[PDB]
Amino acid sequence: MKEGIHPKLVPARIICGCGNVIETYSTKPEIYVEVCSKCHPFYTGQQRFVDTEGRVERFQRRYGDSYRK
Amino acid sequence: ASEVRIKLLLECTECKRRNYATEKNKRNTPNKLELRKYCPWCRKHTVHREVKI
Amino acid sequence: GSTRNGRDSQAKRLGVKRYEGQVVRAGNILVRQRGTRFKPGKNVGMGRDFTLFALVDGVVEFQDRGRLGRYVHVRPL
Amino acid sequence: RLTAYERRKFRVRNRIKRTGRLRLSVFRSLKHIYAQIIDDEKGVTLVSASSLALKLKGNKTEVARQVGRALAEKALALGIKQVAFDRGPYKYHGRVKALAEGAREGGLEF
Amino acid sequence: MLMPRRMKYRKQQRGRLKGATKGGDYVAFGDYGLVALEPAWITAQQIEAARVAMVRHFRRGGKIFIRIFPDKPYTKKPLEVRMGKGKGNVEGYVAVVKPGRVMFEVAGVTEEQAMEALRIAGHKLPIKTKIVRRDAYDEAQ
Amino acid sequence: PLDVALKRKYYEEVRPELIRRFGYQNVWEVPRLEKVVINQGLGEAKEDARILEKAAQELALITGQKPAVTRAKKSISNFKLRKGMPIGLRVTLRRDRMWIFLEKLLNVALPRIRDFRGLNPNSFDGRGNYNLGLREQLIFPEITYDMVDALRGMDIAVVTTAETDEEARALLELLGFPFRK
RNA sequence: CUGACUGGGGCCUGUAGAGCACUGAUAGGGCUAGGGGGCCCACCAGCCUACCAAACCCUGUCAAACUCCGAAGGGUCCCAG
RNA sequence: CGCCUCCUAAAAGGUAACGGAGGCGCCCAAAGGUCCCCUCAGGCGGGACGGAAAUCCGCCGGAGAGCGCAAGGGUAGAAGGGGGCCUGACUGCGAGGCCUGCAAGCCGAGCAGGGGCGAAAGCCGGGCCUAGUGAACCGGUGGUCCCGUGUGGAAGGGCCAU
RNA sequence: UCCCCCGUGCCCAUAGCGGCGUGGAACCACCCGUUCCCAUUCCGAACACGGAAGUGAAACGCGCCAGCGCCGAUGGUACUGGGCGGGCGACCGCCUGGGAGAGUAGGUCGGUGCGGGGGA
Numbered sequence: 001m002k003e004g005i006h007p008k009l010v011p012a013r014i015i016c017g018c019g020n021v022i023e024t025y026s027t028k029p030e031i032y033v034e035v036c037s038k039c040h041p042f043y044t045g046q047q048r049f050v051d052t053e054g055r056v057e058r059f060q061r062r063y064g065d066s067y068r069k
Numbered sequence: 070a071s072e073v074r075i076k077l078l079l080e081c082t083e084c085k086r087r088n089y090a091t092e093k094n095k096r097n098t099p100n101k102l103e104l105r106k107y108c109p110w111c112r113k114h115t116v117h118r119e120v121k122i
Numbered sequence: 123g124s125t126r127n128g129r130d131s132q133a134k135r136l137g138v139k140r141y142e143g144q145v146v147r148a149g150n151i152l153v154r155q156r157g158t159r160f161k162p163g164k165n166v167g168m169g170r171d172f173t174l175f176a177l178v179d180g181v182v183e184f185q186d187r188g189r190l191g192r193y194v195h196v197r198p199l
Numbered sequence: 200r201l202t203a204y205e206r207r208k209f210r211v212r213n214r215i216k217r218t219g220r221l222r223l224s225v226f227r228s229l230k231h232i233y234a235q236i237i238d239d240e241k242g243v244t245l246v247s248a249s250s251l252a253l254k255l256k257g258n259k260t261e262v263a264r265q266v267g268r269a270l271a272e273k274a275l276a277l278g279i280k281q282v283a284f285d286r287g288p289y290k291y292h293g294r295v296k297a298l299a300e301g302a303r304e305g306g307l308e309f
Numbered sequence: 310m311l312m313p314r315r316m317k318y319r320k321q322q323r324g325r326l327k328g329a330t331k332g333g334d335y336v337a338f339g340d341y342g343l344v345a346l347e348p349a350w351i352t353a354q355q356i357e358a359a360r361v362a363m364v365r366h367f368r369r370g371g372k373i374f375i376r377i378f379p380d381k382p383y384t385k386k387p388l389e390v391r392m393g394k395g396k397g398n399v400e401g402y403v404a405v406v407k408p409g410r411v412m413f414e415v416a417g418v419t420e421e422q423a424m425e426a427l428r429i430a431g432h433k434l435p436i437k438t439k440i441v442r443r444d445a446y447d448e449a450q
Numbered sequence: 451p452l453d454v455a456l457k458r459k460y461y462e463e464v465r466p467e468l469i470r471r472f473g474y475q476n477v478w479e480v481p482r483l484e485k486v487v488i489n490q491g492l493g494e495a496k497e498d499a500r501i502l503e504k505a506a507q508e509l510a511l512i513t514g515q516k517p518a519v520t521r522a523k524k525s526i527s528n529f530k531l532r533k534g535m536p537i538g539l540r541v542t543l544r545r546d547r548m549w550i551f552l553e554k555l556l557n558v559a560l561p562r563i564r565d566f567r568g569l570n571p572n573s574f575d576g577r578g579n580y581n582l583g584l585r586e587q588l589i590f591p592e593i594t595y596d597m598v599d600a601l602r603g604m605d606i607a608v609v610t611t612a613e614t615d616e617e618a619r620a621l622l623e624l625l626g627f628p629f630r631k
Numbered sequence: 632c633u634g635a636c637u638g639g640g641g642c643c644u645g646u647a648g649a650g651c652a653c654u655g656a657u658a659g660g661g662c663u664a665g666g667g668g669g670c671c672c673a674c675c676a677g678c679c680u681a682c683c684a685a686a687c688c689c690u691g692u693c694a695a696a697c698u699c700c701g702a703a704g705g706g707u708c709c710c711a712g
Numbered sequence: 713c714g715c716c717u718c719c720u721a722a723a724a725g726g727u728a729a730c731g732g733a734g735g736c737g738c739c740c741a742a743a744g745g746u747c748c749c750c751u752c753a754g755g756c757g758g759g760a761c762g763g764a765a766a767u768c769c770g771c772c773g774g775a776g777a778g779c780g781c782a783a784g785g786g787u788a789g790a791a792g793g794g795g796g797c798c799u800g801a802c803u804g805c806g807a808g809g810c811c812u813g814c815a816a817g818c819c820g821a822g823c824a825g826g827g828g829c830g831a832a833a834g835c836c837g838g839g840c841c842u843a844g845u846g847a848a849c850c851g852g853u854g855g856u857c858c859c860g861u862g863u864g865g866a867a868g869g870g871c872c873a874u
Numbered sequence: 875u876c877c878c879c880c881g882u883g884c885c886c887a888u889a890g891c892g893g894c895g896u897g898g899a900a901c902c903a904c905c906c907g908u909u910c911c912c913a914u915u916c917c918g919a920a921c922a923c924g925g926a927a928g929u930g931a932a933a934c935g936c937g938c939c940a941g942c943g944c945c946g947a948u949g950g951u952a953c954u955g956g957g958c959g960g961g962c963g964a965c966c967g968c969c970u971g972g973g974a975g976a977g978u979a980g981g982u983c984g985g986u987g988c989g990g991g992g993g994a
């Protein structure tokens with residue numbers, strides 16, 4: 001590589017919120033990230049964050065069978 | 070040749086004689102031409118300067 | 123009624139000037155041409171206007187080299 | 200469809216052939232280096248030299264030099280003195296350069 | 310009627326009418342053809358009159374193939390001027406036609422119909438013509 | 451060459467699975483990563499603050515490689531574009547730097563992508579290469595909110611020695627490329 | 632003795648003719664972006680076209696300023712009459 | 713109304729008309745020399761903003777792109793694109809020719825001086841080429857130090873360059 | 875003087891495209907590295923250097939295949955130098971010498987020189 005025009009790559013720790021630590025290389029030796037592949041909802045099986053709801057509607061009303069028959 | 074593309078002389082900077090005629094575009098090349106050139110009087114190459122024709 | 127044509131330029135007298143087997147002297151113009159319809163071969167130079175001319179005394183020889191073009195050679199006598 | 204390599208080769212070689220000198224061609228493989236001095240007018244090789252033929256051994260540059268010296272010695276034996284260097288597709292540098300320098304040390308003229 | 314949509318040059322030298330047709334001498338589409346017996350410049354208006362005569366005869370049905378095209382500009386000087394002052398203006402377009410040319414072909418029609426239509430068409434043209442029928446000779450071309 | 455997890459993961463786990471999945475008879479026949487090419491289309495730097503040196507500084511922090519300027523082949527009326535104008539950045543990553551970039555790309559970058567539902571399965575060359583585009587540079591761990599003036603994304607070409615999309619799909623997913631469908 | 636003219640040999644050429652590979656023209660058919668139109672929608676798509684049609688392919692053609700080709704001749708040099 | 717390109721022009725050259733079509737009266741300090749490197753248009757597939765067309769990736773693609781500008785010839789085995797160093801866009805000449813009524817116009821190896829690039833072979837006396845131009849006369853400016861009306865100077869001229 | 879490979883020429887597609895098969899001992903290539911020389915408008919991709927674990931996957935070489943591309947008769951014709959006729963003309967013929975282009979039959983998945991290294 002041409003000298004003096006590139007950022008040097010050093011060993012690096014990327015630290016996620018989930019406690020994941022990634023040993024890699026970068027131009028900044030320490031980095032914090034809010035998310036990573038190990039915790040992100042799309043990756044983790046299908047950990048459906050807040051809504052694993054399943055619609056819920058529309059026959060999901062059932063309040064109730066009370067009309068006459 | 071035109072108003073902007075002028076004719077000019079090259080003067081041997083050492084003995085002051087005009088040895089070459091040529092042209093330049095004074096919009097593109099506003100500074101005086103400086104060129105090494107053979108001077109037949111000095112019998113060697115010499116920096117020649119642009120001088121009004 | 124009038125014409126906006128009526129122009130033409132002087133004919134330039136281009137072409138081969140010395141054909142194969144002709145005895146030429148060095149400097150003899152061999153071909154006047156636009157671009158390289160003929161290419162300089164052995165003992166033939168080429169001028170800034172593509173003019174082919176003999177570099178040595180000798181005999182003119184032509185050669186057609188397919189995709190490599192037609193060449194004009196001079197063979198020393 | 201030609202390659203950069205093929206074009207580069209033609210380009211430097213065509214230029215050499217125009218001058219009409221005996222042509223010193225150099226082939227450089229990953230392992231070896233070869234030289235033949237060629238008469239392009241008769242389409243014949245006059246003298247040859249290579250690392251493969253001399254069973255040379257060590258550092259590729261120092262080897263190149265030696266095959267150069269060798270080519271020279273044989274060449275001078277045939278009365279071949281003046282030559283034109285055909286670097287072909289190679290930069291004039293390193294191994295090729297070394298061979299060239301070795302040829303010159305031997306008294307090949309170029 | 311027929312004329313080039315566009316061209317490289319507005320005006321053409323007149324040229325010559327020597328020889329039999331270059332090509333176009335065998336029936337290539339229809340069952341019957343109208344062949345040129347004499348050389349001529351055939352005008353676009355002649356061609357159209359021939360066409361219209363044939364569709365008029367057919368009334369409804371049949372297919373006409375027009376195998377010549379007037380791409381040659383026809384030139385005439387404005388009336389009562391003298392010679393000189395440049396080439397006259399383009400007044401029309403003509404198809405160069407030489408002996409043996411199949412100018413028109415018909416199909417989808419009975420022999421009686423085709424014979425008659427091509428006859429009437431021939432009367433609109435400035436040359437002698439011949440009616441022909443598709444042949445093995447044509448097929449072998 | 452550096453010990454890097456993804457690179458190691460390619461040789462240790464990915465190669466055997468690929469040899470398995472397709473049964474190559476030659477070690478050279480199995481899908482390899484040739485280069486990753488990153489391109490910033492930019493040209494919002496055509497005139498104006500034609501200092502895209504801000505962007506080049508950003509690309510270099512991301513890749514460890516200084517991008518090279520791209521210039522307009524011809525002049526263009528409607529994009530307001532004259533020949534030779536500096537319109538973009540392009541960096542060709544190979545070997546250890548290529549692995550390192552993809553490594554962070556999978557682990558960190560793509561996760562940080564907004565409303566990420568996975569890479570587009572259909573974006574394959576047809577000849578076994580893949581391409582994806584980004585909206586922001588903030589995706590990457592190297593870039594923070596402080597140090598960035600504006601939002602500029604990029605194009606990413608991942609070139610493979612694989613002859614088919616099938617093979618290329620196999621290799622890339624094995625490496626950890628997360629596909630939606 | 633070199634001449635016109637002629638025999639042999641080599642080189643140069645782009646006409647006649649022809650051709651359509653290039654530049655353009657070109658009828659019909661096929662195939663098929665693009666519109667016109669009709670069903671059916673504003674929920675953004677669909678289906679039908681004896682409608683005008685680009686590119687492409689087929690059949691058939693056109694050209695002083697077209698040529699993948701290409702004569703007869705013509706020119707020039709050498710030896711000989 | 714001079715000049716350039718094509719056709720007319722009858723396959724060497726040349727060839728007319730108030731015959732058919734277009735251009736020129738500039739330009740470039742690099743768009744010049746050399747050394748090194750690189751190869752197009754276009755089609756298809758892929759890619760944030762990005763579109764028919766900006767930049768990126770892959771495949772096909774001999775030249776249909778490019779070559780400042782008309783047209784023709786030529787051309788990637790570069791004349792096209794990029795970079796380094798540069799000024800040969802030399803001085804003094806010039807075998808030999810092309811063209812040709814004259815006068816012009818054109819090509820030019822090679823020798824010498826002092827250079828540029830290159831390891832070298834070598835190339836370089838502007839520009840891919842063909843238009844971008846104007847004989848004398850009269851006069852200007854720089855140089856030269858040749859003439860200088862009895863002599864020394866001077867006036868004024870000559871010569872070289874413009 | 876025979877076969878294989880490596881260089882380098884010549885003919886200038888009968889030599890090319892595509893398909894298939896084949897070769898690593900040798901040679902060639904990819905390859906292993908990027909300390910050193912040298913190098914990237916970024917990149918050891920290229921250029922370059924030092925190597926020698928591996929693979930003939932890519933490239934290259936060598937076979938086979940006629941889908942394409944390329945080549946292509948013999949006949950006959952057009953045209954025509956020279957010589958003659960005919961038509962009022964546009965134009966049409968005869969004699970003698972020359973003679974295409976298109977197309978048909980068919981051909982082609984190269985041939986050959988010089989020097990190296992290896993094999994018999």
Ligand SMILES: NC(=[NH2+])NCCC[C@H](N)C(=O)O
Nearest residue numbers: 703954955956966967968970
């Ligand atoms: N050289 C020749 N024989 N030319 C023949 C042409 C003469 C005449 N026009 C003819 O058709 O017969």
Ligand SMILES: [Mg+2]
Nearest residue numbers: 001002003912
């Ligand atoms: Mg360094």
Ligand SMILES: [Mg+2]
Nearest residue numbers: 124125126127
């Ligand atoms: Mg007028």
Ligand SMILES: [Mg+2]
Nearest residue numbers: 127128129731
């Ligand atoms: Mg005229």
Ligand SMILES: [Mg+2]
Nearest residue numbers: 128129130714
């Ligand atoms: Mg005039």
Ligand SMILES: [Mg+2]
Nearest residue numbers: 130131132133
């Ligand atoms: Mg004239």
Ligand SMILES: [Mg+2]
Nearest residue numbers: 131132133134
């Ligand atoms: Mg003239």
Ligand SMILES: [Mg+2]
Nearest residue numbers: 131132133134
């Ligand atoms: Mg002329």
Ligand SMILES: [Mg+2]
Nearest residue numbers: 136137138643
């Ligand atoms: Mg000639």
Ligand SMILES: [Mg+2]
Nearest residue numbers: 168169170171
């Ligand atoms: Mg020259």
Ligand SMILES: [Mg+2]
Nearest residue numbers: 170171839840
């Ligand atoms: Mg020149």
Ligand SMILES: [Mg+2]
Nearest residue numbers: 142183184185
């Ligand atoms: Mg011969």
Ligand SMILES: [Mg+2]
Nearest residue numbers: 164183195197
């Ligand atoms: Mg010869």
Ligand SMILES: [Mg+2]
Nearest residue numbers: 322323324325
């Ligand atoms: Mg006339």
Ligand SMILES: [Mg+2]
Nearest residue numbers: 350351352403
């Ligand atoms: Mg009439």
Ligand SMILES: [Mg+2]
Nearest residue numbers: 323383384385
């Ligand atoms: Mg008329």
